[PDB]
A paper describes a structure:
We selected MBP (45 kDa) as a new target, given its larger size. However, the MBP-bound DARPin–apoferritin complex did not achieve the desired 24-mer structures, likely because of the strong interaction between the DARPin and apoferritin, as well as between neighboring DARPin molecules, similar to as observed in the GFP-model 6c complex. Comparative analysis revealed that model 4 exhibited significantly more 24-mer structures than model 6c. The ample space between the DARPin and apoferritin in model 4 allows the DARPin to undergo conformational changes upon binding to the target protein. This characteristic led us to choose model 4 with an anti-MBP DARPin for effective binding (see Section S2). After initial data processing, a significant number of particles were selected for 3D analysis based on their 2D class averages. The initial 3D reconstruction, performed using cryoSPARC 3.3.2 and targeting the symmetric core of the scaffold with octahedral (O) symmetry, yielded an overall resolution of 2.69 Å, revealing distinct amino-acid side-chain features [Fig. 4(a)]. The C-terminal domain (CTD) of MBP was well defined, with the side contacting the DARPin showing higher resolution than the outward-facing side.
In this study, we present a novel DARPin–apoferritin scaffold, with a larger size of around 1 MDa and higher octahedral symmetry, meticulously engineered for the binding and imaging of small target proteins via cryo-EM. The modular design of our scaffold allows the adaptation of new DARPins through minor amino-acid-sequence modifications, enabling the binding and visualization of a diverse array of proteins.
Numbering used by the authors:
A (entry chain B): 140 to 278
B (entry chain A), C (entry chain V): 35 to 350
D (entry chain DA): 186 to 350
Amino acid sequence: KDLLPNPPKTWEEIPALDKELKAKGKSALMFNLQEPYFTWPLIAADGGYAFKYENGKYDIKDVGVDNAGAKAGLTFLVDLIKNKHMNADTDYSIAEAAFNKGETAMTINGPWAWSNIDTSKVNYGVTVLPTFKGQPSKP
Amino acid sequence: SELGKELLEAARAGQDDEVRILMARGAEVNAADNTGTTPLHLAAYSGHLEIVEVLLKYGAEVNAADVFGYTPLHLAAYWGHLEIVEVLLKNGADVNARDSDGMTPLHLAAKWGHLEIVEVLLRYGADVEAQDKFGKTPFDLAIDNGNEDIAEVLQALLAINRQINLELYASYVYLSMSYYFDRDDVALKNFAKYFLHQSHEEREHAEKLMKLQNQRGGAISLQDIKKPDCDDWESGLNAMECALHLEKNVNQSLLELHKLATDCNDPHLCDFIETHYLNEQVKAIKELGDHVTNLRKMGAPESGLAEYLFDKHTLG
Amino acid sequence: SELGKELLEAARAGQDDEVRILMARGAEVNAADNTGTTPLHLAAYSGHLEIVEVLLKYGAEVNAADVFGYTPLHLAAYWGHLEIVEVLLKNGADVNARDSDGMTPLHLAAKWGHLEIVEVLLRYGADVEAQDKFGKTPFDLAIDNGNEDIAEVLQALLAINRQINLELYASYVYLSMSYYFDRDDVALKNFAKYFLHQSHEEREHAEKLMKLQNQRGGAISLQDIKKPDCDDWESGLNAMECALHLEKNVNQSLLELHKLATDCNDPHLCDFIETHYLNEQVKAIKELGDHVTNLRKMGAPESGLAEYLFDKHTLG
Amino acid sequence: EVLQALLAINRQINLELYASYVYLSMSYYFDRDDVALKNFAKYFLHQSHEEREHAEKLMKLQNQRGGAISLQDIKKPDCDDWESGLNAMECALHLEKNVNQSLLELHKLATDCNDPHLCDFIETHYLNEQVKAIKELGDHVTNLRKMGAPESGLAEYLFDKHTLG
């Protein structure tokens, strides 16, 4: 809450604000890039979906990754990594440890790390992930 | 790379003392990682000029492309670091380097709204007409993101360069016309003399525009001069009518240039145009219309006596 | 076509009286058969000028293509009929008409060895560089069939036109160089003055070659003038070295032109070249080499005091 | 509109009178016995008198329109001691750029007030002279920097002789 009093609601805002944090010696977003479990909200927000799931049945022939939404999400990922907003070799440990120090301002996490941030005593808040191109994230 | 990652950490962190000691130990400067990121890349991304300076003192590569195509100039133009852009250009950085998207550094600086970077890039010969994979010029990226002064600069520069090329074109048409009229089957000496005079006047017009562009600090950029539409004109009347059509086209482009200069709030350009160009065009159009109506009244082209006597009495 | 085949028989047979009576009865002149052969086609193939003249008097089509692409001009050039070639060109026949093979009438006249047809076709603007489906120019068809004088004419014409374009190119390089040297960050006025002088001298050289070509009865043919290699020269030394390289190239092409003129037994062209061009090139190369060695001895480009003082004392 | 245009023209008169006094200071710095550069001093005296003429032209214009000239104090230049020929040329360039910027604001104000005579006066007598002066002063600065000044005393002597001579 201290590094950012007003969270953004668009992923398209994340690059620009990152330009601010390098001016303070900070990083905008740092999380585990080594898992699809973290990245699937963004890439599958606007058209990606793991398996087609209807009426309680998962279609096996309908693995959706060759979609324009998955393309858009992965291009946004390569725009966040090409201009060096984040690092590619980062993972969960460095991310959470730096957020406990308060170096990176944003992170994405489930419940299991909440108490860990309660060890940091950083005045923090929790909110929904930003939407992307109007289509909200899909954890 | 025994000290190469030791250079990568100081490039990420910005310690002039660390890199000074590493150059005292002779650390290698071309330490590429798995994705091509050099110590110069991180030195540019960080924005500390001293590590960049000493890296270039020990011979780091200025045009090292990564797996995405970015050079240090690209990243420097993205993040808006003026001095390192200047010293990269001073050390032979390629100003028209394309990335994977075909986006030059000028595309980036116009997309993000950095004026001084745009101007320093224009000084070193950045291409105004470079298109990316979507067919976007930097002018398009500047209007799409609301950087109106960048778009003004980019539009005025292109318009003056096109007017220079158009004045050079018209001189070559008059050269063609002049040497048509002294062929041994077109024996009209005063027609040829008249059109050689016009050729040299248009050469002077183009040189005046070049001098003006140098006084303002803009960048002259020359293109091909295309060949005239005919090698064979047909008569004195037909060539006079083609010359009238030509000067009307030139006048129309000058009026568009004046309207563009008035939108950009440039009174000096407006006064330059209306003092040296707009009255000469009116005079030339009046004189060429005079010649056309007199030649038509005398009975040309189907009277060979008419063009001979026009040659003697009007052009003589 | 009630009298159209009645025109076809007289066109095959050549009766001025028959076609005079058929035009007294108002016979149609555009009688096309199943393969496109008009009465004008047979009138041209036969070689009687009177039937062609009256067919054009009644408005026959001059550019009627058959199913193979031939016009009356093609057939006239094949069979070597000079007067009908002349009057077809006089009535607006397209001189660069391609057949199914892409062969222009000039291809045919060069392949068969008709000099006067070749010359009349060159007077009206026939393309020397037209290639057929095999990539053959008329020069190639003339050397393959032993028509050496045709090939001589075709080679000399192309060489003089290329020298005209090369002199026009060099003037534009000097214009670029001159306006580089009065940018506000390159403040050398006498360099700029020197290169403007060279620009105008090269314009004069090109105009002299154009006047010579008009005195001989040859056909000037202009092409595009391409942009110089740089917009940004780097110093006075570098521009002087580029100018030396340029003038050496021009001298080499002039020597090739002289050797070609000596093979063609043209003493007037040889004396023209060695009187107006070969000594000026030697003088220019000597002067530019002088400038380069003096600038290198003074310590340029890495001495800014050297170029300032060279500007004052040598070019002043 | 009347009240704004009047104030703007009076401020431009005072600004032209200010620039003449800076050039006077610069000129008499360059003939001190420890700064013995005669052609620098001659150059800056010429500029001083030209700026006096610019101010007098604006005063004559204001009298033709029926407006009220109102004079203020002329403040002293920022330095008594310039440091070299290069530094004084750079200060003169900065000065003429400031004057040009205020002239452009005056022209925009005149265009809002629908005054074509003032616009043509400004762009005929003032806007092209500023462009010429800025081009010439930038020329002088780059040549002096290339020759090796200020830390080369041979550079300023020879610039004095060959360019300003």
